Ligand binder design. Structure first.
Ligand SMILES: CCCCCCCC/C=C\CCCCCCCC(=O)OC[C@H](O)CO
Ligand SMILES: O=C(NC1CCN(Cc2ccccc2)CC1)c1ccc(I)cc1
Ligand SMILES: O=C(NC1CCN(Cc2ccccc2)CC1)c1ccc(I)cc1
Ligand SMILES: O=C(NC1CCN(Cc2ccccc2)CC1)c1ccc(I)cc1
Lengths: 217, 212, 212
C-alpha cells in the first residue's frame, strides 16, 4: 500500500547518488576559483616599477607573501633559471605554480627577440623596467610597452616579441599550465641542449606543485 | 607473371617522359627584372601603400597569376633563427612572388635553397654577411639583393624592413627550411597550416588559369 | 675450492687505468698561453691580427696548427646565435679556433664539460652570468673564461672577433655547436664542413703524436 520494497529502494539510492554526484562535479568545476586576480598582479607590480628591479623584486616578493600565505615558494626554493623558447632567451624566477595558475619574475639583461608562442592559457606581463615590443600577427606595425604598462597575451594568439636591454617584469599566467612548459622547453631541448636548466625548471614546478598540495591540507 | 611488372613500368616510363618534356617546355610568368623594377618605383612610398599599389599592378600585367584578395594573408615565417612575416602573391612549382619583412627586426641564417631568391627593398635595411668573408654589406630601399642557389649567408633585418621577393627554382623544397623552426622551436602548427594552405591556393590558381 | 655465482676484480683495474690515464695527460698549450699571445695582437685589424697570430702559433708549436690549405671559415649555429669559426688546433682534449661575427649575435653559451677562454681581438663581448641580473662587457684585449658546467647568456657586437682556446671533453662540445645546424638551419653542408675541420685537426694530432 504505502510500502517500498527494500530491494527497489537500494537501487533508487544508487541512481540517486549517481544523479547527485554527476551534478556535484559540474558545480565544482564551474566554480573556477583562482588564487590570484589578473588585475591584482598588474596593479601590485605597477607600484614597484619606479625602483631598481633588484629592490623592487625583493620588496614585491615580501608583499606577495603576506597577501597569500602558503601560495608562494620559500626563500630556500627561490631560483633564477634561464628560459629558451621561440628563439628568444630570458630568465625566470618561479613564485607560484599550480595546474591552472603561475606567477613568476621574468626578464633579460641583454635583451632578446623571438616567437611569442601559442599557449592554452592567458598570460599577462607587467613591465618593471626596460621595454617590451609586440608585433601582432597579421599586422605590419609593432607596439612598445614601458614600465608601468601591462601587455596581455591571449590564448591561441601568436605574436613576435622583443625585449630591450635590462628589461624586467612580473608575470601572471592562467590556463592549462603543464602544456605551457612544452613550448618553454622546446629550444632548451633542440637548440641549447641545456638539460640542467631543464631539471631546474621541472624541479621548480614540482616544488611549486608540492607546496599547493600541502597547503591544501 | 613477369609481364605484369613490364606493363607497370611501361606506363611508368611514358609518364616520366611526359613529366620530363613538360618540365622542359616550361615558361615563366614573371621576369627577374620585372619584379625588381616594379618594386623599386614604389619603394619611395610607405610600405602599406607600396604593397597595395604593386599587387594591383602585378594583377594588371599578369591576370590569372595573382591570388585574389580573399586568399591574401600575412603568415609568420620562422626559419634559420630569424623571424618575419610573408604574404604570398603567386606560387607555382618553379616561381613565387611574395611580400616579406619584419616590424621588429631579426637576425639569422639565410638558408641554403634549391632556388634563386631576389629581394628588392622597399623600406628598412638588409644586412648580408657572405660565407667565407669577415665583412658585411648593407642594402637600402630601392636596391635588390640576390641570394644564389646553394649560397649561405648571415642576414640581418633592421627594424621595419620590407621587401618584394621573387624566387625561381624547386619551390616545394624551399618550404622545408622555412618551417624548420616552426616544428622544433615555435611549435606553431597553426602557422604551418596557414603556410601550406596559402601554397595550395597558389597552386590551385595556376592550375585553373592553365585549364580554364 | 669453488666460488658460487667479479665487480671487485673489474673495479680495481678500471679505476687504476683511468687514474694512470689522467696522470699521463699532456696538453699542448698552457691554460693562459693562448690568452697572452692573442692579447698582443688585439687592437689591430682583425685580419692582420689573425695572420700574425697564426704565424706565431705555428712557430711556437710546430706540428699542432693546421696548414693554410686546411684553414676555412665555417658558419656556426648554436644556442640561437650564429658565428663563424676557423679551427687551428683540435684534439680530443684541446682546441684553438678563431671565432667572431660581422653582424653580431645573441644566444646561449652552452653547458660544456670543458673550460673555454676567449680573448677579444675586436668588437665587444657581453656576458650575462646565470643567477645574476646584470651583464658585463669585455673590450679588445680582455679575456673571458667559461668554466665547465657554467651557463651564461652571451652577446657579440658587430665586428667582434676573438681567439678561443678550449680544454676538456671536446667531442661533447661539438654536440652543442651543431645543435641549430641540425634542427634549425638544416645546413648539412656546414655540418659537413665542421666535422671535416675536426677530422683534420685529429688527423694532424695523430700524425704528430705517432711520427713526431
Ligand atoms: C638541383 C636543382 C638546382 C636548382 C638551381 C636553381 O634553382 O636555379 C635557379 C635559376 O637559375 C634562376 O634563374
Ligand atoms: O618560463 C615560463 N614561461 C615563459 C613564457 C611566457 N613569458 C614570455 C612571454 C611570451 C609571450 C608573451 C608574453 C611573455 C616568459 C615566461 C614558464 C616557466 C615555468 C612554468 I610551470 C610555466 C611557464
Ligand atoms: O617562407 C618562405 N621563404 C622564406 C625564405 C626566403 N626569405 C627571404 C630571404 C631570406 C634570406 C635570404 C634571402 C631571402 C623569405 C622567407 C617561403 C614561403 C612560401 C613559399 I611557396 C616559399 C618560401
Ligand atoms: O663552433 C664551436 N664552438 C662554438 C661554441 C664555443 N665558442 C663560442 C663561444 C660561445 C660562448 C662563449 C664562449 C665562446 C666557439 C663556437 C666549435 C667548433 C669546433 C670544435 I672541434 C669545437 C667547438
Amino acid at each position: 500500500q504505502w510500502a517500498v520494497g527494500r530491494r527497489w529502494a537500494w537501487a533508487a539510492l544508487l541512481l540517486a547518488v549517481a544523479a547527485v554526484l554527476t551534478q556535484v562535479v559540474w558545480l565544482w568545476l564551474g566554480t573556477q576559483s583562482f588564487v590570484f586576480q589578473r588585475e591584482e598582479i598588474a596593479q601590485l607590480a605597477r607600484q614597484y616599477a619606479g625602483l631598481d628591479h633588484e629592490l623592487a623584486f625583493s620588496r614585491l616578493i615580501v608583499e606577495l607573501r603576506r597577501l597569500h600565505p602558503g601560495h608562494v615558494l620559500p626563500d630556500e626554493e627561490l631560483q633564477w633559471v634561464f628560459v629558451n623558447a621561440g628563439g628568444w632567451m630570458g630568465a625566470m624566477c618561479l613564485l607560484h605554480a599550480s595546474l591552472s595558475e603561475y606567477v613568476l619574475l621574468f626578464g633579460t639583461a641583454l635583451g632578446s627577440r623571438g616567437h611569442s608562442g601559442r599557449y592554452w592559457a592567458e598570460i599577462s606581463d607587467t613591465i618593471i623596467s626596460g621595454t617590451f615590443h609586440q608585433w601582432r600577427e597579421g599586422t605590419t606595425k609593432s607596439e612598445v610597452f614601458y614600465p608601468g604598462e601591462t601587455v596581455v597575451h591571449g590564448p591561441g594568439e601568436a605574436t613576435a616579441v622583443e625585449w630591450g636591454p635590462n628589461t624586467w617584469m612580473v608575470e601572471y599566467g592562467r590556463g592549462v599550465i603543464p602544456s605551457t612548459l612544452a613550448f618553454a622547453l622546446a629550444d632548451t631541448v633542440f637548440s641549447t641542449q641545456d638539460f640542467l636548466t631543464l631539471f631546474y625548471t621541472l624541479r621548480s614546478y614540482a616544488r611549486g606543485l608540492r607546496l599547493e598540495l600541502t597547503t591544501y591540507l
